């Protein structure tokens, strides 16, 4: 009753440090915290049976949806079973070799071998780490740096989190490292010189790439670490022809593309792997979020065949790889995988990400486009964003001061129930809701946000 | 049939990449692979049916024991009401806050908060990036190095695996990185002079840890990490009055002492926490492994009330914090850890941990020590150790070529269906085994180590 819910919140604020969250206002009372206890669709519900519409899919990973039964029952069978064995030295349950075998029949067709990790972040480090010996391997010591872009997002730790090109994961913590440099952020809306088309946009950032590959030197540059498309940056589509031009560069320095598919993996854009539909030949893809549907952790380092054969030399060379987690391919993540990418074909969901998402879109820019303080509408599948503008003609943004953003998303949460995200470093409302999303929901979604920019801009 | 079972096989050779696996020889099917089916006890059993004691609880983890149905009922409980909503801005489950105020409960009095992360490695990561967080709050930019100790194992990840003291993970990877430097392995055995008492060696190590300190500038270094018992570079427990010694060295320079309790922590050596049991004072404790009894992943970084009073002041100077994981306080991982620390005192496990290992390593000690070949059999709760030299009187040890522990543990696993692992960089036979083993498992693990022993050295 009441004095157990009060007594939660005590222990929550006197014993829980919370990811992404004001520590000392949670630790002393001044801001809310919020219990979860139930989810159903693209709804989910606190312990006081308030209903929220997750625009949001938890954070891009609720995929098939809340309260499937499918895959909850498919982790209680494997924790009745065998919740855990590890996979040392080719220890591996069904579930694993099972998951392992299906990520790699949906993955692209230049790719070998699947390495489990817990997150997306662990995953990108896995990434860095096989790079390195990759270029040991084949006697490149100096060929080691990584470009990142600005507005990147690829975790959350030391190296990862210079990866990320976002400065609330950078100030305070010294990053990002010397060892990984950043290029333009892939984001047209928000260019230097607004005289410029796409096509110009496009060839900038070519320009760009060039200049800190002749200031670095391609013999120091190992990998491109790219999202097809920006999440956490601000859901920004590439633009026209920039990954066959930026492409190019790489190949012409023989610099390896990681492409980061923690968001878009296994169907948000409409499409099976992001990869495939902006058109990226990777040699090393990132998984996770999707993979399991949030169900259970799990991430993935997929290689491709160039990287593998490379990786077969140093194995017989060296003996055994030096790189483990304890908890790799644990059993329940994987379990909740094939669970997950079972439910993900069964229930034609990937197909309702792509029809779905591009309503979503169509709609949204129709309803709020023409806004005075709408810059932009723009998205692709299950991914939509909304960035708003003091003045649009000059593009003159508001001060960050003004927490318009903020607003807005808080605005929709108490005015319609409606959880959709401020996203960093902007004011910019993002959406990324779970695949079942019906038509009807999405009319909801838009209708709401309408209300909420009206309430707080007019 | 066995038409499935070769094809598993070959599924998992042609597509998943495990860790600490000789990977070319895997993927060729030159080096043999093996699938758990289920498991119970002490006992894991493959998909043949063979059943296998293991002595290594999976990685020094299966805590509780194999097939504790009431944690696979705990998990299943949560996965069916709600397997995942994200944890930042202050969002929780109640199995998230109820393990956050258990750990608590458990941890020395001095800690503050809790911090989840999936596994020991982003733990390690998580602390370093709230070292540095906190030198930056406190207007000391400099102090930023980590000193850790050869033979330290504290994760396989680029800037933790830095931290690791153990040439796997550093070879072919550049690591370790700058910011990281090592002091003297606390290795009695493995001393470089022969006629220092144990007495004698710690003063050693203080000395070593003196003239680090001296050459770098105590200005410059933020944190010593220790694991209180050293697990996979040995199974070594610390000298007598090391751990005195060492502190107050690092309380005379102010550098944080970080306790890697990811295998002491939860009772393995007969007591909660390795840093009450040894008598460490840390202001940072890493937790993982035994938090959940690996049935769920889950890892923990406890904060003391100092760092937590810089914390609070960093997030009202400068915002929420700027790190988080999508996985952060997982559900599941929060519902097994609830079941597993509740099973943990129910069935009196760290009572029998510390009885019956004070029994594995007397009997051990009694059927091996006087072997010409045993240089050291060593131990403390559930942890145990034996140490082969071709010479005892000079310390002679095998050439590393020949393989003397990677065979004896081969040899335990042919003849006796019992897993103990050869440990890395020496030929030491570890036991890490569940805390329900019983004397009459423990005869059974001493008495087929003896004939292994044997049978490869007479």
Tied chains: 1, 2.
């Excluded at 139930?38 to 519900?45: Q, R």
């Excluded at 950043?182 to 946009?201: G, K, M």
């Excluded at 779905?356 to 949204?364: D, I, K, Q, S």
């Amino acid at each position: 009753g009441m004095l157990k819910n009060d007594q939660l919140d005590q222990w929550d604020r006197d014993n829980f440090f919370h990811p992404s969250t004001h520590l000392a206002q949670h630790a002393r009372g001044e801001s809310a915290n919020r219990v979860i206890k139930t989810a159903s669709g693209v709804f989910i519900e606190d312990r006081d049976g308030t209903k929220l519409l997750d625009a949001f899919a938890g954070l891009y990973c609720v995929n098939v949806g809340y309260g499937r039964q499918e895959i909850a029952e498919a982790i209680a069978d494997q924790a009745r079973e065998l919740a855990y064995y590890h996979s040392y030295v080719g220890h591996g349950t069904e579930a694993s070799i099972t998951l392992a075998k299906m990520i790699l029949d949906r993955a692209p067709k230049n790719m070998s071998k699947v390495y489990f990790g817990l997150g997306g972040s662990d995953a990108n480090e896995t990434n860095v780490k096989l790079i390195w010996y990759y270029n040991n391997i084949l006697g490149r010591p100096e060929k080691k740096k990584i470009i990142s872009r600005w507005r990147g997002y690829h975790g959350s730790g030391l190296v990862t989190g210079s990866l990320t090109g976002l400065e609330l994961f950078h100030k305070k913590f010294d990053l990002p490292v010397e060892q990984v440099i950043h290029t333009e952020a892939p984001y047209y809306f928000r260019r230097e010189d607004l005289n410029q088309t796409e096509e110009q946009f496009v060839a900038h950032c070519v320009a760009e790439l060039e200049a800190l590959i002749e200031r670095e030197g391609a013999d120091t540059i190992a990998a491109f670490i790219g999202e097809p498309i920006l999440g956490t940056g601000g859901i920004v589509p590439p633009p026209a022809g920039y990954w066959e031009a930026i492409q190019t560069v790489l190949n012409k320095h023989d610099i390896l593309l990681v492409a980061d598919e923690v968001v878009t993996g296994f169907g948000r854009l409409g499409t099976m792997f992001g990869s495939d539909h902006y058109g990226l030949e990777p040699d090393i893809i990132t998984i996770a979020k999707g993979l399991t549907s949030a169900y259970a952790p799990l991430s993935g380092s997929i290689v491709s065949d160039k990287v593998w054969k490379v990786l077969e030399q140093g194995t017989d060379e060296n003996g055994p790889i030096g790189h483990g987690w304890t908890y790799s391919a644990h059993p329940i993540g994987a379990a909740a995988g094939v669970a997950n990418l079972k439910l993900l074909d069964e229930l034609n969901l990937v197909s309702n990400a792509g029809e779905v998402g591009a309503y979503l879109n169509a709609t949204m820019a129709e309803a709020l486009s023409q806004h005075a303080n709408v810059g932009d509408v723009r998205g692709e599948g299950l991914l939509c964003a909304v960035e708003f503008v003091k003045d649009r003609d000059s593009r003159t943004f508001f001060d960050a001061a003004d927490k318009i953003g903020p607003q807005i998303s808080a605005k929709l949460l108490e005015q319609d129930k409606i959880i959709a995200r401020a996203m960093p470093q902007g004011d910019i409302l993002g959406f990324a809701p779970p695949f079942c999303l019906t038509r009807a929901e999405a009319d909801q979604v838009v209708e709401g946000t309408l209300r909420a920019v009206k309430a707080v801009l007019g």
